[PDB]
Design a protein around this ligand. Sequence first.
Ligand SMILES: *CC(=O)N1CCN(C(c2ccccc2)c2ccccc2)CC1
Ligand SMILES: *CC(=O)N1CCN(C(c2ccccc2)c2ccccc2)CC1
Lengths: 304, 304
Amino acid sequence: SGFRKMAFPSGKVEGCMVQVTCGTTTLNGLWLDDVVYCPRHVICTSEDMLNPNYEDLLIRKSNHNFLVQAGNVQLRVIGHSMQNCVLKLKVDTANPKTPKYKFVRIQPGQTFSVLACYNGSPSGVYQCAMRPNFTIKGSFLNGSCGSVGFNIDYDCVSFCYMHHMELPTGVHAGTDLEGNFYGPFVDRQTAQAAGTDTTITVNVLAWLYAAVINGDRWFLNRFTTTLNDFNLVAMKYNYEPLTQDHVDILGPLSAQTGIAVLDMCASLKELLQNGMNGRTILGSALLEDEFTPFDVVRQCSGVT
Amino acid sequence: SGFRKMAFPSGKVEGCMVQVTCGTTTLNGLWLDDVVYCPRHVICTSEDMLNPNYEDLLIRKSNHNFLVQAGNVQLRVIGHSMQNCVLKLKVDTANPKTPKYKFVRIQPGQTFSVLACYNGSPSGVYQCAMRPNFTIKGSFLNGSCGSVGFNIDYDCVSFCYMHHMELPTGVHAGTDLEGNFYGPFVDRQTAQAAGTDTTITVNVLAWLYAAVINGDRWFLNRFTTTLNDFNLVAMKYNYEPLTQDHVDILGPLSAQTGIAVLDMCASLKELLQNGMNGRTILGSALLEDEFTPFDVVRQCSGVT
Ligand SMILES: *CC(=O)N1CCN(C(c2ccccc2)c2ccccc2)CC1
Ligand SMILES: *CC(=O)N1CCN(C(c2ccccc2)c2ccccc2)CC1
């Protein structure tokens, strides 16, 4: 037992990290098969980022201008193309460590692991969630761009995020691996504000189920509620509305604990209305929303 | 910017995980060079754990009784020995993926990453701290024993923990890689209670410095304090006493932020005495103590 914010083992992704340099700009790239993926702003100078015309800036770059280094060895770039906000650098060598992989575009509320990198070298791994406002709250310093977010299903790595930007508020924005930004963000040094960062209700409920499985039960009450009644309270507290699809997804946790989904909703409602009163749940003094129902099942069952 | 509970990239450790089976007991082993390290309770049945005499139980085991499997391939065991609470299984093949490594015995308050494994396969990675009562609050199910805790200094993995037990309270106990338990715990199915889980004061201060670096400054006050005055409050709140050695270790963070250590202590004192008043620091509603001063520096600088 015990319940932790857990990331996927990062080995499969560490074997894909490379350094990409274009002029004086250096960031991370993801090497899969014979293609290196990286943010297209690798071609920009600081002056370019105020209002970059990427198609125009890219005309001045040739294959030999993209310096790709995997560990201590240089890769030969034999092609380059821009797909949305990512550059795809075709190299002459397939990455021998390429895992089975997929590119997926996640939904708000979904979680993933990030392998934060600098100069193509991994520094750490942490668990994130795509916020309902399409930002992520990461830990990214200058040079971390090109670090990726991913999930793993046994031996298949599903890449879902590539880091591109930090908003003036310190929150993060990036793209899927086809180069499309999550949310309305653009790769330009222009002040872009995030929308409301609402709480992922279905994740909070999943985490309350993880708490009951792991021994923290003080918050369980004698009440029940309905979806409509719960949602009036969810709206008041800037929580995402709960749907029947979310109830369905929580079914396995409901079954395992014997606590009906709407009863857990009534516990959540009282926690929202009364607070924690100085108490903690799974060592947290706030309601955690960055564990999905699948994450709780995975951790509580021991999937490898 | 942004500050996250971050684990070390786990690739170097994933390459060392193996499965060890003895009779009907299966757990994880750590394969480094030609030795596989695992908890000695792999030799026990459930009946043995009530009061095991390990030297006696081990006499009945031969090299061929320890089944060691690295991925899908079996390793040949050519020797076995017990060192404290770990078994060392000499195998005929050096692990080709053995990283540069060391075995270290950490101090309470120190943090490390855990690669939780089942059947020699990695399931996830999270960050822990050795509590002042010599327990860790992990996420370990049956079969996770033998999973290890570690730190990494560029290319050197320092192994510090091997998981052995879960106390009846749901907290965890284990050994260093020489098989010595942290704290007074023994590998036996006997109720053993943990001492006071005090808060690691120097880590809380480091995390408050990380908060000021990352923009969360509301808690900074107009006060200062002394070590002795601070420690009267630390004692009242079950915080570890702060020493001059801890002040010295926080020097770089003090220098970077321009906030004297004792001034940060006065902010901590007011937070202890008044609470957070519904506010958060780095997204937490409680004072986080599982980041060391070195962790804050590492994360805030981008060490790979
Ligand atoms: C994540 C990372 O490595 N950085 C943050 C984004 N920086 C961009 C940039 C590109 C080229 C020259 C200067 C700065 C950037 C700036 C503004 C908006 C989007 C991206 C690079 C460092
Ligand atoms: C961590 C893990 O895999 N487990 C928890 C400890 N279990 C021990 C054990 C050994 C052999 C047969 C049954 C149980 C154990 C029990 C009691 C005290 C210490 C260790 C194995 C599963």
